[PDB]
Fold:
Amino acid sequence: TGAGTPSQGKKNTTTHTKCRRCGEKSYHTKKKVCSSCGFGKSAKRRDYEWQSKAGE
Amino acid sequence: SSGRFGARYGRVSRRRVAEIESEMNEDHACPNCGEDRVDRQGTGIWQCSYCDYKFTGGSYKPETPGGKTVRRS
Amino acid sequence: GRRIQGQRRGRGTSTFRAPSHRYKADLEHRKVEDGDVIAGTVVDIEHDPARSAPVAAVEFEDGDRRLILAPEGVGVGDELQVGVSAEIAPGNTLPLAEIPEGVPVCNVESSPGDGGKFARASGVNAQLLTHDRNVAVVKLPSGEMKRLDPQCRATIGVVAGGGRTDKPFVKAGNKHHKMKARGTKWPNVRGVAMNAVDHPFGGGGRQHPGKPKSISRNAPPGRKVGDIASKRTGRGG
RNA sequence: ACGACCGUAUAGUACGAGAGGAACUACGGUUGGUGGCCACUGGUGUACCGGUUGUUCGAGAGAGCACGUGCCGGGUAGCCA
RNA sequence: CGAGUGGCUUGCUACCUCGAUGUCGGUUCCCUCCAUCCUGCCCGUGCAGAAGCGGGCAAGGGUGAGGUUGUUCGCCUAUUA
RNA sequence: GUCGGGUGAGAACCCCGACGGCCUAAUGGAUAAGGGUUCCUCAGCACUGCUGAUCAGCUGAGGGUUAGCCGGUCCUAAGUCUCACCGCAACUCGACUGAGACGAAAUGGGAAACAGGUUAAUAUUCCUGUGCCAUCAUGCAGUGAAAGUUGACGCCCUGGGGUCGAUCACGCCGGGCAUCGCCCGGUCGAACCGUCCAACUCCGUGGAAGCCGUAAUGGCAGGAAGCGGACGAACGGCGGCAUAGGGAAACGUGAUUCAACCUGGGGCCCAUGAAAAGACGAGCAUGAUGUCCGUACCGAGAACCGACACAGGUGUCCAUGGCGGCGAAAGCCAAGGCCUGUCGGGAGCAACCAACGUUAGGGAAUUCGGCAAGUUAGUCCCGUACCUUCGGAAGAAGGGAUGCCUGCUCCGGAACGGAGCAGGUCGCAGUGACUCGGAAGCUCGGACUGUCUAGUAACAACAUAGGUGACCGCAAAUCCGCAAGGACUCGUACGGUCACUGAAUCCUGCCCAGUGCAGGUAUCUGAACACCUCGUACAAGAGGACGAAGGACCUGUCAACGGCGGGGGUCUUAAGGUAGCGUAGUACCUUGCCGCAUCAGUAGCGGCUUGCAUGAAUGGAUUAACCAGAGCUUCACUGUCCCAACGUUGGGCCCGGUGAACUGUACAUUCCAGUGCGGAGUCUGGAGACACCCAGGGGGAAGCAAAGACCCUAUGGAGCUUUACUGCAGGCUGUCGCUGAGGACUCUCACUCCGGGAGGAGGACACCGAUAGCCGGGCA
RNA sequence: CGUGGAAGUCUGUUAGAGUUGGUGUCCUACAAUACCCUCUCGUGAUCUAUGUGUAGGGGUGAAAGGCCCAUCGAGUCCGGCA
Ligand SMILES: [Cl-]
Ligand SMILES: [Cl-]
Ligand SMILES: [Cl-]
Ligand SMILES: [Cl-]
Ligand SMILES: [K+]
Ligand SMILES: [Mg+2]
Ligand SMILES: [Mg+2]
Ligand SMILES: [Mg+2]
Ligand SMILES: [Mg+2]
Ligand SMILES: [Mg+2]
Ligand SMILES: [Mg+2]
Ligand SMILES: [Mg+2]
Ligand SMILES: [Mg+2]
Ligand SMILES: [Mg+2]
Ligand SMILES: [Mg+2]
Ligand SMILES: [Mg+2]
Ligand SMILES: [Mg+2]
Ligand SMILES: [Mg+2]
Ligand SMILES: [Mg+2]
Ligand SMILES: [Mg+2]
Ligand SMILES: [Mg+2]
Ligand SMILES: [Mg+2]
Ligand SMILES: [Mg+2]
Ligand SMILES: [Mg+2]
Ligand SMILES: [Mg+2]
Ligand SMILES: [Mg+2]
Ligand SMILES: [Mg+2]
Ligand SMILES: [Mg+2]
Ligand SMILES: [Mg+2]
Ligand SMILES: [Mg+2]
Ligand SMILES: [Mg+2]
Ligand SMILES: [Mg+2]
Ligand SMILES: [Mg+2]
Ligand SMILES: [Mg+2]
Ligand SMILES: [Mg+2]
Ligand SMILES: [Mg+2]
Ligand SMILES: [Mg+2]
Ligand SMILES: [Mg+2]
Ligand SMILES: [Mg+2]
Ligand SMILES: [Mg+2]
Ligand code: NA
Ligand code: NA
Ligand code: NA
Ligand code: NA
Ligand code: NA
Ligand code: NA
Ligand code: NA
Ligand code: NA
Ligand code: NA
Ligand code: NA
Ligand code: NA
Ligand code: NA
Ligand code: NA
Ligand code: NA
Ligand code: NA
Ligand code: NA
Ligand code: NA
Ligand SMILES: [Sr+2]
Ligand SMILES: [Sr+2]
Ligand SMILES: [Sr+2]
Ligand SMILES: [Sr+2]
Ligand SMILES: [Sr+2]
Ligand SMILES: [Sr+2]
Ligand SMILES: [Sr+2]
Ligand SMILES: [Sr+2]
Ligand SMILES: [Sr+2]
Ligand SMILES: [Sr+2]
Ligand SMILES: [Sr+2]
Ligand SMILES: [Sr+2]
Ligand SMILES: [Sr+2]
Ligand SMILES: [Sr+2]
Ligand SMILES: [Sr+2]
Ligand SMILES: [Sr+2]
Ligand SMILES: [Sr+2]
Ligand SMILES: [Sr+2]
Ligand SMILES: [Sr+2]
Ligand SMILES: [Sr+2]
Ligand SMILES: [Sr+2]
Ligand SMILES: [Sr+2]
Ligand SMILES: [Sr+2]
Ligand SMILES: [Sr+2]
Ligand SMILES: [Sr+2]
Ligand SMILES: [Sr+2]
Ligand SMILES: [Sr+2]
Ligand SMILES: [Sr+2]
Ligand SMILES: [Sr+2]
Ligand SMILES: [Sr+2]
Ligand SMILES: [Sr+2]
Ligand SMILES: [Sr+2]
Ligand SMILES: [Sr+2]
Ligand SMILES: [Sr+2]
Ligand SMILES: [Sr+2]
Ligand SMILES: [Sr+2]
Ligand SMILES: [Sr+2]
Ligand SMILES: [Sr+2]
Ligand SMILES: [Sr+2]
Ligand SMILES: [Sr+2]
Ligand SMILES: [Sr+2]
Ligand SMILES: [Sr+2]
Ligand SMILES: [Sr+2]
Ligand SMILES: [Sr+2]
Ligand SMILES: [Sr+2]
Ligand SMILES: [Sr+2]
Ligand SMILES: [Sr+2]
Structure:
């Protein structure tokens, strides 16, 4: 069984869903954590300085 | 009895299994009554088909050399 | 390199854990205040997944139903006593002080009240040798002379299921079923059969530990493999 | 687009004490190569005719399917060696 | 001992090629060379004959099948002009 | 697919009929995930669709999913999160312990619904008929109420009960066929309410000393059979339900084999096969309440994932439709579905290619190699070697039989079950297709089943049982974390950790010098603090005394790393290779020598063997069995070959339609020589050369595809190693603080551990903070 | 002689799992791992669905440097960064 096309057929698991807090399809329904805004992980909003160039 | 093993494993393994299961399957004298009606129910568990006496003993024999020593002292 | 298997174990992930959710109970001695007026009846004999040996279900006078580390010879209907004034009989529990010298014992406590630590596996037994007002000398299954507090509780007789070790597994599948009931990663891949990155003995064309196996006691984890602080090796000498 | 060989007559002759043993020339055939042809022999021939197994069309008759013929036997033309 | 020719072996060089020109052997198919193994025509002989042996002209045609080994090579077998 | 026809401006592919076909664990039916309107209707063809299109999963416009009793919702599983507590510089981080919540839609547990009718599209939801559950209210009864039972459970073999289905017998209703008289379909009817009860268990009677009983095990004076009785089953039987429903009609009755479902007996475990909510226990009438969320459709060779309407991938159930046969096998056929694994037209349709059929004689001569193909084949009877771990080898081998028809016999209750006999008779051929082993010997390797490089390696590699060594008494050994803490562990030496070897069998020699580990150690060496001397009004600093682990030194140890030679009739550096095996998967020389086998054998096997450079758990030897493992031989067989032929299907060629990509400095009709950075279509000299187009196999363009897959270079990178350099974790050891009272000691009061508690054990140690010395590829 | 029905037991395209050889077909593919035949396993160290856990010098690994979403002798993303 190849890692490519043949293995893509088994993909029918729902994980990332629309997030109640930010509206992005990043709420991981299994972990119950939003990979975009961090809902379910932190009260504060997920944010990082590396999300932009250093001097901007 | 090790005929279920076929031509596999070698003499010693299936010689010991044979001798052990031979003695294990024998008619064992019940501690309660005197009848040779004790059978194994599982690992170290024995029971008499006559009086229904369920008791502990060796894994393959209802009595071990060590267990027989307890009585004396 | 990469952490060796022995280090992966420590993390306590699923692969290395024991099937605790499947286990029955810790066969600790009952806690009696005093008077010894605690006796019970063996209601059933059960198989213990954690020790591959039979264990006994007892129903005590005060209404307590508990599983007991059963010696050989215990059967349903039999009455068991636990306490200072307990009768000197197989399956009965009482402190070492009340036990007569030269009597096989099992499930011996390390510190009075702990519930039993020594001599608990299939067929084994400790031997109560010397008595005293301050110390009870017991010979453990390993042959070691152990000095214990005479107040330490123990059960008279040898542990049930003796001779278990006498029959060979014969096949891998049999070992397999047993290992599923324990906290152990099995089968076992030899160090010498792995890559250099995975173990101190890995690498090199043909297989061989490119170094002496006797490792120091002070060796750090990851390096402490092979023959740990061996006083000697081999069969000769 | 023809190359080569074997055999027979020459001849048990010439030669040679003997043993052995030629040639010119005339013939017959083989082999390798070459071009073409199917009367003959052989192959094929899911044209065709026959036998026959399972199943379906109620039987019979007559058929379908079982790979480009279910399987088996024979084989015209044609193409072939 | 001396003088040469070839470019089939090996060595030497590093001139061409590393933003890549697919190694050996075999197979299949085509052309060629001559330092000729056979075949044609010759000369000598320590050429009677038969057969050898050595040499000359000559590249039209031919030079096959098999056993071990990947082998090229080579050893081996029976055929062969 | 074809012939007719329908609609339309237009029809090969949209629809009707006929004829011809395809799918049968699926190409049919119901669904989980996932998709999200793809579902239904009307109107369309610019877009999407491998051609066309009036069609559509496409475009436009509307419409469509109805629940007390089907899921959800409730329960708890592995496990997750939150809060508290604690750690952390800190947190959105981290372990424990408490509490709370979360965690199962086919497929865990679970109160209750069936039949029919209806729509373009829903349907146990709507409608009709009937039924049922829970809660609450009212009324009667009830004083019982919580013990117990249930929910609730592994694997293997098996009996009994029994429905559907299928089949047989006969009747009825309807259809088909038309030499016969046979062939097909139907013959219905639920939940629920009521009732019946086999098995198991128990009681009474009885009184077996050999009887009772089973498919099998088994049972009994501790009371067998027999007899009577209590408790007690089906999704089953029976009655109601039902002058309900359904059917054009009839509107059956018996039987066998019996999936579901019910209930028993036996066996296995170094393996022991959830939990919780809930339910029963615990009556009946009447009435009220039963909200919220899901509900369409696809579920795949076009609705999912794979960029696609992709030959891939993707869970569950329909596992009992007929013939066939051992069969959930093949093949053929129903019910049902489809002609969309969606471009067509034409040429006896050439070469060439893909898949195939058939080939005389020879029969492996082909090839590295029987690669490919083929041979054999089902079942019954006879018969079956070496070797063997006694299991096996074995379907060894080898030999014979096999259909149809007529009449029978035996086993069984019987089968539409099985085993045979006699007679008759057809073919080239009777397992007639289909299904369906070729066989034998020798050698190497690994014992065996098992594992593996998703995507060039399935093996001799990994694993394994078995053998062995090492560590540790549990306040342990080993391991994770900075810490709080944690895995092992509901574990305790018959344990579990760390390693090596690799079934059985016979065995496993010598070496402790080096290295490693461990123990000991008079003496030597060995840091810091404190102490002492000098120095400084102090301090830096110099020296001294004491000296832990460590080292020196001694000892133990090879199933510890490893070693087992050269020379001579010892030497390096400890020993100097024992049993066995041996030209080996190890032997360079080498195609070693002898032999076997062959016409011929660098192969293979046997023997020899001084072994360039075998050898004993770096395991040696040996080995039955096993193997898509390497090599060799034989029989059988055949187009592998001699040497090729003919044929079949799909392409290829021609026509309609659709319609890319690779590649492209330029020029370019070349050929032979030469020259040139020595490998030129383009330079030179000659030769040849009228242009364009079709088909072809690929000689050349050092053809196209990639800033090699070999080599070197760079004060390039990375992974790996170690007695490289330098450091860092970690362990050990001393010292200071925690830390108290009276080079050796006692105590208790901190602190630690055990204990539910009282209290016990220990104790100024240990833990922890700081520092010092040693070890330190575990890590950078 | 029968009964019994054991087995990491045998045959087997039952379901299901896998992949020895053809170095077949394909190789601007149906397909960035496909097709066909042959072949292996198929009561167990079996296969399989969903849920759940382990995370990057870290997992997981019957060990092949295998696997951790077409990439692994150290994933992916963005940032350091021109
Ligand atoms: Cl074990
Ligand atoms: Cl010949
Ligand atoms: Cl639902
Ligand atoms: Cl029974
Ligand atoms: K190059
Ligand atoms: Mg316990
Ligand atoms: Mg496990
Ligand atoms: Mg191993
Ligand atoms: Mg390796
Ligand atoms: Mg390493
Ligand atoms: Mg080794
Ligand atoms: Mg150069
Ligand atoms: Mg090139
Ligand atoms: Mg010449
Ligand atoms: Mg010539
Ligand atoms: Mg329409
Ligand atoms: Mg519908
Ligand atoms: Mg299609
Ligand atoms: Mg022939
Ligand atoms: Mg040849
Ligand atoms: Mg073959
Ligand atoms: Mg009869
Ligand atoms: Mg060999
Ligand atoms: Mg193997
Ligand atoms: Mg691979
Ligand atoms: Mg394999
Ligand atoms: Mg072992
Ligand atoms: Mg062991
Ligand atoms: Mg090994
Ligand atoms: Mg091995
Ligand atoms: Mg030899
Ligand atoms: Mg040794
Ligand atoms: Mg390059
Ligand atoms: Mg490169
Ligand atoms: Mg390289
Ligand atoms: Mg250099
Ligand atoms: Mg580097
Ligand atoms: Mg504690
Ligand atoms: Mg390093
Ligand atoms: Mg899973
Ligand atoms: Na020269
Ligand atoms: Na070549
Ligand atoms: Na010539
Ligand atoms: Na040869
Ligand atoms: Na009933
Ligand atoms: Na059938
Ligand atoms: Na079409
Ligand atoms: Na197997
Ligand atoms: Na040594
Ligand atoms: Na050696
Ligand atoms: Na295998
Ligand atoms: Na052929
Ligand atoms: Na070309
Ligand atoms: Na690297
Ligand atoms: Na028997
Ligand atoms: Na394959
Ligand atoms: Na990394
Ligand atoms: Sr899935
Ligand atoms: Sr969170
Ligand atoms: Sr931020
Ligand atoms: Sr405990
Ligand atoms: Sr406890
Ligand atoms: Sr190594
Ligand atoms: Sr020894
Ligand atoms: Sr003549
Ligand atoms: Sr003569
Ligand atoms: Sr046909
Ligand atoms: Sr046949
Ligand atoms: Sr010449
Ligand atoms: Sr000549
Ligand atoms: Sr050469
Ligand atoms: Sr040679
Ligand atoms: Sr369906
Ligand atoms: Sr149009
Ligand atoms: Sr539609
Ligand atoms: Sr819930
Ligand atoms: Sr359910
Ligand atoms: Sr099962
Ligand atoms: Sr039955
Ligand atoms: Sr529906
Ligand atoms: Sr499919
Ligand atoms: Sr596939
Ligand atoms: Sr049909
Ligand atoms: Sr189409
Ligand atoms: Sr024919
Ligand atoms: Sr051959
Ligand atoms: Sr040959
Ligand atoms: Sr035969
Ligand atoms: Sr061996
Ligand atoms: Sr695999
Ligand atoms: Sr052995
Ligand atoms: Sr030593
Ligand atoms: Sr020797
Ligand atoms: Sr010119
Ligand atoms: Sr072409
Ligand atoms: Sr099997
Ligand atoms: Sr099989
Ligand atoms: Sr291959
Ligand atoms: Sr083939
Ligand atoms: Sr193809
Ligand atoms: Sr490919
Ligand atoms: Sr079976
Ligand atoms: Sr990706
Ligand atoms: Sr950057």
Summary: The interface with chain C takes residues 5, 9, 12-14, 16-17, 20, 31-32, 42-45, 53-61, 63-64, 66-67, 69-71, 73 of chain B (CB under 8 Å). Residues 1-73 of chain B form a domain with the N-terminal domain of TfIIb fold (CATH 2.20.25.30).
